[PDB]
Design a protein around this ligand. Structure first.
Ligand SMILES: *[C@@H]1O[C@H](CO)[C@@H](O[C@@H]2O[C@H](CO)[C@@H](O)[C@H](O)[C@H]2NC(C)=O)[C@H](O)[C@H]1NC(C)=O
Ligand SMILES: *[C@@H]1O[C@H](CO)[C@@H](O[C@@H]2O[C@H](CO)[C@@H](O)[C@H](O)[C@H]2NC(C)=O)[C@H](O)[C@H]1NC(C)=O
Ligand SMILES: *[C@@H]1O[C@H](CO)[C@@H](O[C@@H]2O[C@H](CO)[C@@H](O)[C@H](O)[C@H]2NC(C)=O)[C@H](O)[C@H]1NC(C)=O
Ligand SMILES: *[C@@H]1O[C@H](CO)[C@@H](O[C@@H]2O[C@H](CO)[C@@H](O)[C@H](O)[C@H]2NC(C)=O)[C@H](O)[C@H]1NC(C)=O
Ligand SMILES: *[C@@H]1O[C@H](CO)[C@@H](O[C@@H]2O[C@H](CO)[C@@H](O)[C@H](O)[C@H]2NC(C)=O)[C@H](O)[C@H]1NC(C)=O
Ligand SMILES: *[C@@H]1O[C@H](CO)[C@@H](O)[C@H](O)[C@H]1NC(C)=O
Ligand SMILES: *[C@@H]1O[C@H](CO)[C@@H](O)[C@H](O)[C@H]1NC(C)=O
Ligand SMILES: *[C@@H]1O[C@H](CO)[C@@H](O)[C@H](O)[C@H]1NC(C)=O
Ligand SMILES: *[C@@H]1O[C@H](CO)[C@@H](O)[C@H](O)[C@H]1NC(C)=O
Ligand SMILES: *[C@@H]1O[C@H](CO)[C@@H](O)[C@H](O)[C@H]1NC(C)=O
Ligand SMILES: *[C@@H]1O[C@H](CO)[C@@H](O)[C@H](O)[C@H]1NC(C)=O
Ligand SMILES: *[C@@H]1O[C@H](CO)[C@@H](O)[C@H](O)[C@H]1NC(C)=O
Ligand SMILES: *[C@@H]1O[C@H](CO)[C@@H](O)[C@H](O)[C@H]1NC(C)=O
Ligand SMILES: *[C@@H]1O[C@H](CO)[C@@H](O)[C@H](O)[C@H]1NC(C)=O
Ligand SMILES: *[C@@H]1O[C@H](CO)[C@@H](O)[C@H](O)[C@H]1NC(C)=O
Lengths: 234, 116, 229, 318
């Protein structure tokens, strides 16, 4: 739907429509749906990952990021056990199938609930955005809009190509991928992003971005340019 | 403009790959979020498809009935949102046809008037 | 028809109010001017955020970071871009101002030749035969209410360019000759009001062997019965 | 009968400012973005011109609420209008004279041309309606309903309007019709042989063609760069150096578009003024009768007939 929008920077803006290009989850794109009933595979990281999960009992407690995740390289580990968030970037020896039962360069220690996250790597910096909100829905991701604020930026310098989650065993989760799309972000009077337009979603959205507005008056507008792309080089 | 192939000495013309402006034809978003797209000055090849001299119009239904021009496309073609409703394209009407009952001995003289 | 005319006028004004009160697009010509100028200024302000090749669009950030020998280079890039931006703005304002001036000149012409007088110029002061106009002010503009006479209902009459009497060809001084199928009348061109054809309505020139389409009738001489009795 | 020729419109050009400056180049486009709205405000200015070109055409020709047509029997009192009325045998129903006018007035760099909203056929239908109205109902179709009147009587009014008593027309109707018919034949001989007759419309075409040719030729200029060809800069220099050479081309090419657009806006204003004049004449010349001296040709104006022409209107003033 319209999930996967985060504040692109740390500047306060209000009562304004701002056009920005960054790695956002494309609107109405497909996100892989994983289950935790009666499912913690290794997924590609690509150019950045949108992650979301639904909880009733805090089953999902962490993440692993790296290339091989087997003590051969440095791998970012994030774990939240009870009230203590733990972040480490050691060359961890992970299990053949990592789970939690019910040469380190960094360490830090601190359905009813939807917890959305954005994980991206720019020039060695692992940027984390997130938002927690109450929900009343078991089947799937709730439809609606909520922007994610940044919380953490870790200068790990780790080449991340794959990642894996960590489940608490005695909670479905979703994995999407970010693209360098241009978005028109609508900031309300309190500086909260309340809506957004994905400028490559469809011709109407292209029109809205061109006119810098979420409303399009009746008429014909020139919004872009069609160009046939080459298939191969000669 | 053209090149000579360096391995086999024949001349190849270079024609830049098809391109053109893209326009979006839309009723206001206070009515509908349905749109039609006009690919300006292209054929309906490289791109409910109507070929006009303005370009290749996709998403608008071609209607035989003329109407007053609403959202102009070009080359005599206008589009509008009508009936269940959708975007239609048609050749615009220039007005109602009305012959004058001319003869060499007949005059029409107004008998009443209105102040407007 | 004074009562009819006054009632039609009064009704027409009420219609103006209903249109203006409900059709926002009615004032599009003035709203568009406001929008073009607002867009021009918003564009000009947004250009301040551009780098134009500089390390930063913010002048203070260049100055707070670079020594003069280097800061001046970055600043020249911003000056060229911002100076160019103003020149673009001003040029557009001069061209737009010319358009407004032409409109103002037209409005002034109408005021004189529409409100202060009566226009014989067709469709200069609305469609129809112009009677009078009334100015109303509007934001950055003028609105004219043009009161016009428009023919409403018509009939098909048989006509003739002239009428024969004693071999003499009689032409209307004003109006046209009409026939209802049995009798010929003379009437004003813009309103059917048939009158008996008399020597005081027509004039004589030439004779019946010249005019194409001339018809036979009689022309009444008002003097005859005064001398006859 | 005299002929007055006025421009109404100009070619609706449209230029893709990004493709013109940075044709198929990502490296150049990213540099172009550092100039903010300088590119898109030019696209806006040219669009504004293209739109008013349809407005100009509409204001001049679409002054009639209905499409009037003459009767199958041309009983117009001896006045022959067959050379100004539409010819049914043509693929486009234009008059003989209009065809004469159309036969006298004559890339991949992001430069395209948009079609007019009103095609030549539609313009011909409007001039036909205005002409049919003028001939069969005089000025009444301008004010309200088209009220039929015998043509000879219509002329009688036209004569009274110039201070000549109507009996003059009727007594001399054969002479007047013959002089009119001869005058029209003279119009055809002039238009068919004097190319300069349509210079006012040919000049508009030439100025716009020159403006575009100048704009395209500017792409060959270096503007201080090692090469005018963007691909040759990119294929030879690494980004830290290529960007400098590209900025030189961007400045020159962006400046070139600004010069072009400014000239088009000024030229468009000239055309608009001409279109406004043409619209004024249509109303106060074709739909009515002009008391304004030399407004509708030298002499005492009687009536006028519009004819279409490429990007303009031609008036035959009687
Ligand atoms: C991050 O690690 C991946 C491997 O996990 C590197 O991808 C390889 O790149 C080489 C070319 O340099 C290819 O021949 C390999 O086939 C690639 N491997 C895979 C699995 O695709 C990637 O280059 C590393 N990133 C950086 C910046 O070095
Ligand atoms: C001219 O037209 C007006 C209407 O525009 C006529 O006035 C109307 O007459 C009818 C009765 O036939 C009344 O019911 C309406 O209320 C009248 N309207 C107004 C505004 O007065 C008028 O009678 C017509 N005149 C002639 C000579 O036909
Ligand atoms: C043409 O107008 C004349 C004059 O008004 C009509 O003749 C009159 O008809 C009435 C009956 O409606 C008689 O009472 C009058 O005495 C007649 N007057 C004269 C002078 O004869 C005539 O009928 C009208 N013709 C048509 C076809 O309507
Ligand atoms: C109008 O009236 C005159 C008579 O006042 C008609 O003149 C007659 O014309 C015919 C044909 O040439 C002659 O045979 C008659 O002798 C003429 N009569 C007189 C008294 O001279 C004239 O024809 C009438 N016109 C119309 C159209 O009815
Ligand atoms: C109007 O004028 C045209 C000439 O421009 C007349 O058409 C010609 O008619 C003659 C026969 O009398 C033919 O030999 C010519 O070839 C025709 N020329 C064209 C161009 O058609 C036309 O008949 C005249 N109409 C009227 C009503 O007088
Ligand atoms: C999403 O998945 C559905 C199948 O469930 C497929 O039909 C659709 O085309 C996919 N859309 C995208 C954008 O991948
Ligand atoms: C969380 O894990 C850390 C080891 O990383 C452990 O020391 C700690 O006791 C655990 N939980 C709590 C609630 O302290
Ligand atoms: C830590 O890194 C060094 C490379 O500087 C490597 O030789 C060493 O084996 C690594 N330590 C472990 C426990 O793998
Ligand atoms: C801003 O926050 C206040 C609460 O402090 C709330 O009442 C107000 O409605 C908010 N404004 C917007 C635009 O949401
Ligand atoms: C390319 O190869 C062909 C043989 O297939 C040869 O005849 C030709 O001369 C070669 N071209 C050049 C420029 O050497
Ligand atoms: C436009 O939409 C709003 C709802 O946001 C509605 O209140 C308003 O009446 C609508 N206006 C028109 C002209 O449809
Ligand atoms: C499109 O291509 C076809 C040939 O496949 C041709 O007949 C037609 O005229 C072309 N139309 C346009 C608008 O170029
Ligand atoms: C218009 O009518 C003709 C039949 O005379 C039909 O063949 C054609 O498909 C119709 N076109 C549209 C757009 O409905
Ligand atoms: C005049 O006669 C014509 C005959 O075609 C008819 O159509 C028209 O309605 C008549 N006008 C009036 C006012 O009766
Ligand atoms: C008027 O036209 C008719 C044919 O309908 C003809 O017989 C009559 O002689 C003509 N009259 C004039 C004055 O032209």
């Amino acid at each position: 739907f319209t999930r996967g929008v985060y504040y692109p920077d740390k500047v306060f803006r209000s009562s304004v429509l701002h056009s920005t290009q960054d790695l956002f989850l494309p609107f109405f794109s497909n996100v892989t749906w994983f289950h935790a009933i009666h499912d913690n595979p290794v997924l590609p990281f690509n150019d950045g990952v949108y992650f979301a999960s639904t909880e009733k009992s805090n089953i999902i407690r962490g993440w692993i990021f790296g290339t091989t995740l087997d003590s051969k390289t440095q791998s970012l580990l994030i774990v939240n056990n009870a009230t203590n968030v733990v972040i480490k970037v050691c060359e961890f020896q992970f299990c053949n199938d990592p789970f939690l039962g019910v040469n380190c360069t960094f360490e830090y220690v601190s359905f009813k609930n939807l917890r959305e996250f954005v994980f991206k790597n720019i020039d060695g910096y692992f940027k984390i955005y997130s938002k927690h909100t109450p929900i009343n829905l078991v089947r799937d991701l709730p439809q609606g809009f909520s922007a994610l604020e940044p919380l953490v930026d870790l200068p790990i310098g780790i080449n991340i190509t794959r990642f894996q989650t960590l489940l608490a065993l005695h909670a479905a989760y979703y994995v999407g991928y970010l693209q360098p799309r241009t978005f028109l972000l609508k900031y309300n009077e309190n500086g909260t992003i309340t809506d957004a337009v994905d400028c490559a979603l469809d011709p109407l959205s292209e029109t809205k971005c061109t006119l810098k507005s979420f409303t399009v008056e009746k008429g014909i507008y020139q919004t872009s340019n069609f160009r046939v792309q080459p298939t191969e080089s000669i | 403009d053209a090149v000579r192939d360096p391995q086999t000495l024949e001349i190849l013309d270079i024609t830049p790959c098809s391109f053109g402006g893209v326009s979006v034809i839309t009723p206001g978003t206070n009515t509908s979020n349905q749109v039609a797209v006009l690919y300006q000055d292209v054929n309906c090849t490289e791109v409910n498809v109507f070929q006009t001299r303005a370009g290749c119009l996709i998403g608008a239904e071609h209607v035989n009935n003329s109407y007053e021009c609403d959202i102009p496309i070009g080359a005599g073609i206008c589009a509008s949102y009508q009936t269940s409703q959708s975007i239609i394209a048609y050749t615009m009407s220039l007005g109602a046809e009305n012959s004058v009952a001319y003869s060499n001995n007949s005059i029409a003289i107004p008998t009443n008037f209105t102040i407007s | 028809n004074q009562k009819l005319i006054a009632n039609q006028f009064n009704s027409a004004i009420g219609k103006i109010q209903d249109s203006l009160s409900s059709t926002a697009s009615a004032l599009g010509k003035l709203q568009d001017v406001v929008n073009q100028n607002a867009q021009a200024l918003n564009t000009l302000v947004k250009q301040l955020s551009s780098n134009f090749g500089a390390i930063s669009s913010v002048l203070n950030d260049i100055l707070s970071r670079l020594d003069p020998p280097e800061a001046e280079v970055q600043i020249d890039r911003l000056i060229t871009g911002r100076l160019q931006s103003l020149q673009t703005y001003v040029t557009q304002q001069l061209i737009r101002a010319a358009e407004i001036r032409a409109s103002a000149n037209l409005a002034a012409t109408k005021m004189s030749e529409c409100v202060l007088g009566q226009s014989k110029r067709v469709d200069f002061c609305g469609k129809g035969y112009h009677l009078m106009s009334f100015p109303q002010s509007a934001p950055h503009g003028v609105v004219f209410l043009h009161v016009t006479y428009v023919p409403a209902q018509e009939k098909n009459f048989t006509t003739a360019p002239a009428i024969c009497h004693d071999g003499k060809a009689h032409f209307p001084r004003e109006g046209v000759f009409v026939s209802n199928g049995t009798h010929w009348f003379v009437t004003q061109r813009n309103f059917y009001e048939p009158q008996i054809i008399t020597t005081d309505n027509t004039f004589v020139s030439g004779n019946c062997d010249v005019v194409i389409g001339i018809v036979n009738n009689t022309v009444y001489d008002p003097l005859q019965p005064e001398l006859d009795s | 009968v005299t002929t007055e020729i006025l421009p109404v419109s100009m070619t609706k050009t449209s230029v893709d400012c990004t493709m013109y400056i940075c044709g198929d180049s990502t490296e150049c486009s990213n540099l172009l973005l550092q100039y903010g709205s300088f590119c898109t405000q030019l696209n806006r200015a040219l669009t504004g011109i293209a739109v008013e070109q349809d407005k100009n055409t509409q204001e001049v020709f679409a002054q009639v609420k209905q499409i009037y047509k003459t009767p199958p029997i041309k009983d117009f009192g001896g006045f022959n209008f067959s050379q100004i009325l539409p010819d049914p045998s043509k693929p486009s129903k234009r008059s003989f004279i209009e065809d004469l006018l159309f036969n006298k007035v004559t890339k991949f760099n992001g430069l395209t041309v948009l079609p007019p909203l009103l095609t030549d056929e539609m313009i011909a239908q409007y001039t036909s309606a205005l002409l049919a109205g003028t001939i069969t109902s005089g000025w009444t179709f301008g004010a309200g309903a088209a009220l039929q009147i015998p043509f000879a009587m219509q002329m009688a009014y036209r004569f009274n309007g110039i201070g000549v008593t109507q009996n003059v027309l009727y007594e001399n109707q054969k002479l007047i019709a013959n002089q009119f018919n001869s005058a029209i034949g003279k119009i055809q001989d002039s238009l068919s042989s004097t190319a300069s007759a349509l210079g006012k419309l040919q000049d508009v075409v030439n100025q716009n063609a020159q403006a575009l040719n100048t704009l395209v030729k500017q792409l060959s200029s270096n503007f201080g760069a090692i090469s005018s060809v963007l691909n040759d800069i990119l294929s030879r220099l690494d980004p830290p150096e290529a960007e400098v050479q590209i900025d030189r081309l961007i400045t020159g090419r962006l400046q070139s578009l600004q010069t072009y657009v400014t000239q088009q806006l000024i030229r468009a204003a000239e055309i608009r003024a001409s279109a406004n004049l043409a619209a004024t004449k249509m109303s106060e010349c074709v739909l009515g009768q002009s008391k304004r001296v030399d407004f509708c040709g030298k002499g005492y104006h009687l009536m006028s007939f519009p004819q279409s022409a490429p990007h303009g209107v031609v008036f035959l003033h009687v």
